[PDB]
Amino acid sequence: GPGMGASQDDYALIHKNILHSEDLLKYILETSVYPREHEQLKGLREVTEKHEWSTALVAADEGLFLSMLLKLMNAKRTIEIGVYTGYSLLTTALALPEDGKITAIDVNKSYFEIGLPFIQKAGVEHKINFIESEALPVLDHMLQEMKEEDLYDFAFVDADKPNYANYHERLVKLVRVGGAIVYDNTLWFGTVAFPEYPGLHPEEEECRVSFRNLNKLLAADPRVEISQVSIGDGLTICRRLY
Amino acid sequence: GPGMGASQDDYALIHKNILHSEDLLKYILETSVYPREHEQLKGLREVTEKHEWSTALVAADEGLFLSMLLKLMNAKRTIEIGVYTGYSLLTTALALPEDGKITAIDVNKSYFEIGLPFIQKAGVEHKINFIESEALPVLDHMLQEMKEEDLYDFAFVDADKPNYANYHERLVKLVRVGGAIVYDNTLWFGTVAFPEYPGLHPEEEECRVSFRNLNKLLAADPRVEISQVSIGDGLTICRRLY
Ligand SMILES: Nc1ncnc2c1ncn2[C@@H]1O[C@H](CSCC[C@H](N)C(=O)O)[C@@H](O)[C@H]1O
Ligand SMILES: Nc1ncnc2c1ncn2[C@@H]1O[C@H](CSCC[C@H](N)C(=O)O)[C@@H](O)[C@H]1O
Ligand SMILES: [Mg+2]
Numbered sequence: 423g424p425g426m427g428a429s430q431d432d433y434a435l436i437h438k439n440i441l442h443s444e445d446l447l448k449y450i451l452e453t454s455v456y457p458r459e460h461e462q463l464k465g466l467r468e469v470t471e472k473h474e475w476s477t478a479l480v481a482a483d484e485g486l487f488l489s490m491l492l493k494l495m496n497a498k499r500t501i502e503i504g505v506y507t508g509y510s511l512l513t514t515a516l517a518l519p520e521d522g523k524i525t526a527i528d529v530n531k532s533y534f535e536i537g538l539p540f541i542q543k544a545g546v547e548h549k550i551n552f553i554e555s556e557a558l559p560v561l562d563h564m565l566q567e568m569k570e571e572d573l574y575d576f577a578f579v580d581a582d583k584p585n586y587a588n589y590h591e592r593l594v595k596l597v598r599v600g601g602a603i604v605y606d607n608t609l610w611f612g613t614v615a616f617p618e619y620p621g622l623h624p625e626e627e628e629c630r631v632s633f634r635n636l637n638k639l640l641a642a643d644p645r646v647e648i649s650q651v652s653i654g655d656g657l658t659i660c661r662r663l664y
Numbered sequence: 665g666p667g668m669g670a671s672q673d674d675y676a677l678i679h680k681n682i683l684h685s686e687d688l689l690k691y692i693l694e695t696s697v698y699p700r701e702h703e704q705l706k707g708l709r710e711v712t713e714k715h716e717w718s719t720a721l722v723a724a725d726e727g728l729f730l731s732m733l734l735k736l737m738n739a740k741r742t743i744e745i746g747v748y749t750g751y752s753l754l755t756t757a758l759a760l761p762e763d764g765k766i767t768a769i770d771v772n773k774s775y776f777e778i779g780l781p782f783i784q785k786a787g788v789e790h791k792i793n794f795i796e797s798e799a800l801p802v803l804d805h806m807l808q809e810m811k812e813e814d815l816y817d818f819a820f821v822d823a824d825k826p827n828y829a830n831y832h833e834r835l836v837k838l839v840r841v842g843g844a845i846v847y848d849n850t851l852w853f854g855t856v857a858f859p860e861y862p863g864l865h866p867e868e869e870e871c872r873v874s875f876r877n878l879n880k881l882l883a884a885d886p887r888v889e890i891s892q893v894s895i896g897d898g899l900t901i902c903r904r905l906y
């Protein structure tokens with residue numbers, strides 16, 4: 423209701439990790455990520471860690487892994503659902519070739535404007551088509567208009583977690599055969615391992631349930647092959663088979 | 665040579681995980697791996713779990729990740745250093761196209777023969793050229809016979825960990841530009857996060873130091889881009905730049 427509003431401080435899980443210690447995560451970041459992180463990504467990360475929804479920011483080691491996947495599969499056209507301040511978006515734009523194209527969807531353009539100066543300074547703003555909207559209507563609009571020549575190589579899904587299964591029904595048609603769909607946060611702070619988990623915020627409990635259902639759905643889906651990867655907060659890579 | 669025993673039972677770290685939660689690792693395996701694991705991989709894993717060097721067996725969730733990488737980058741010719749009973753080898757042979765080829769190197773073919781019946785029943789033995797040898801002489805011989813047109817798409821490095829930096833100097837010449845080298849176990853039970861770690865078998869301590877040195881080397885190496893990934897016991901993906 424009326425008041426000051428929602429805080430990540432209201433959330434039970436924001437201090438949780440899936441790795442065995444903070445020291446191991448910090449080792450990975452300092453040894454293997456920060457020396458390889460573009461200066462503009464570093465700047466965008468540092469301002470975002472002061473933001474009120476900083477817990478949503480994609481992990482920097484996960485960022486380098488997404489970049490690696492994009493380059494190894496020679497992706498050119500991608501879609502991103504859930505932009506926030508733009509860390510995964512700038513990661514993707516830096517990884518794609520000069521003529522790469524990204525369709526980036528987020529309900530809140532004000533977050534994107536936080537990262538836009540870093541994206542501009544990195545010289546890759548020209549690859550991004552940002553759409554301010556709930557993602558489901560955009561995807562449904564694409565599906566009546568897109569042709570085979572416009573299919574995406576890669577999709578990164580990092581928006582409202584309870585809608586992932588609904589996004590999946592559209593994305594297995596919008597990503598090419600042999601293309602990849604990556605769902606972020608599919609281990610949800612480790613809570614998915616438990617049929618009950620005490621003391622969660624109502625929205626956190628909704629995601630625990632939705633990810634437990636989604637992980638079963640993806641594992642059963644004959645239209646894709648999958649790999650769930652314990653990096654960041656967990657992600658699941660899907661590769662479209664037909 | 666003479667010295668102290670170095671069997672798996674003499675090691676300290678066998679049961680340590682890099683994930684905080686044994687339940688979380690079990691959830692990943694039960695939900696996203698076992699339902700997607702080839703019957704012959706299951707059989708090979710099960711007999712290997714009973715073997716005296718079971719600690720060396722690649723994790724099954726890591727297996728599916730490697731298979732995903734191979735498919736997404738359309739790998740066709742690969743090299744594997746460190747075969748053991750053949751789980752990553754069978755994973756790779758199943759992922760490659762029907763005319764794919766693997767050069768598989770191990771000092772001990774009796775390990776390979778444990779897994780060979782499963783590889784044969786899977787119908788993919790024909791993709792494997794197994795070389796019973798120390799890897800370094802084989803790679804040096806390859807350097808003098810290999811032509812530009814036969815460079816490997818992908819290398820998986822999982823053999824004797826203190827030698828990884830030596831393998832790297834050959835592999836950045838044996839894998840094509842844009843190809844991938846994957847080094848297994850680069851987080852070494854999480855012990856790489858500390859300058860010293862008490863209670864280790866000397867061979868375990870040697871790997872801890874060699875991985876701390878390797879991780880710094882790879883992060884500083886301009887010939888590759890990298891992504892260190894906290895899956896299994898940790899792995900580092902390298903993409904050759906020139
Ligand atoms: N229905 C919806 N459609 C599109 N975006 C949505 C959405 N619901 C929430 N979002 C957006 O999804 C984002 C999730 S956070 C995304 C993090 C970002 N990918 C990174 O690299 O850090 C938020 O910016 C939120 O505004
Ligand atoms: N110098 C060397 N050259 C080649 N292989 C070696 C080696 N030293 C040890 N090895 C082999 O490296 C293997 C490491 S265990 C490999 C695990 C396997 N890839 C899996 O998927 O489970 C052992 O089989 C060991 O015999
Ligand atoms: Mg996320």
Ligand SMILES: [Mg+2]
Nearest residue numbers: 722822848849
């Ligand atoms: Mg290994």
